Amino acid sequence: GPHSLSYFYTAVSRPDRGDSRFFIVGYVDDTQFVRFDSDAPNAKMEPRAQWIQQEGQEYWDRETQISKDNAQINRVNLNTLRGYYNQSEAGSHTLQRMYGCYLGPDGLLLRGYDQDAYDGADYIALNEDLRSWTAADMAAQISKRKREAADEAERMRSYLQGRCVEWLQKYLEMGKDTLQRAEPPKTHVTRHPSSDLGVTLRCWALGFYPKEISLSWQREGQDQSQDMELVETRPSGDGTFQKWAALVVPPGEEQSYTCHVQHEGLQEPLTLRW
């Protein structure tokens, strides 16, 4: 799939203290490369990838500044929205934003995006053409009118089309060894026989870099996905992922089943049996 640079903002109101807490994480594809946390003492934007550590104080001074400004503005956004919903000061609330650019095949923007959510409900999205907003309710209509009066949809469109893509291309270069190399899954089958219930065959894939993978089980030249248990792809915590698929088969039939693995880091689709 095409490369992506994405930023994820979370604000939480803290009414015990009458203040807020603010997080950002930056991603290129499935690699976190920066964070910020407004509760950190002398809070700054910190690298979370080796290949970004090299950036000078000039880079960190700008991101840290944006982060602090956003921590301040996002405090009052939470107050604003609480007013729009005529809500108590009792409760905690969350305001999320995400935005980013995909890198098209002719080195231009392919699909830029930008969206917000109050208490996990869609509030506003920038439209596909990036020249207009869609608002989910009466409160969101207030925010949308202000953004329209401020011509902010063209500011986002210029950013997504300009800086976002450009810095995606720079990051992809800086981290090409990790970011552009596909690690194929290390795979095996495990067998767990039971009292009197059938044998469980588990097909493991571990240490693959791009998150996207397909596991399936087949018997004699027919798919079996129908009754197979498939866990959600999970981080290994070293930047790779893992996944397994399991099914129960009659005692003695274990070699009648093959696991099929599809991942973009393999030369050919792969076939496993216990």
Binding site: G26, R147, E152
Partner: peptide, 9 residues
């Protein structure tokens, strides 16, 4: 690098 311009609620 991040967006630095207005995002009004």
């Amino acid at each position: 690098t991040m967006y630095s311009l207005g995002y009004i609620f």
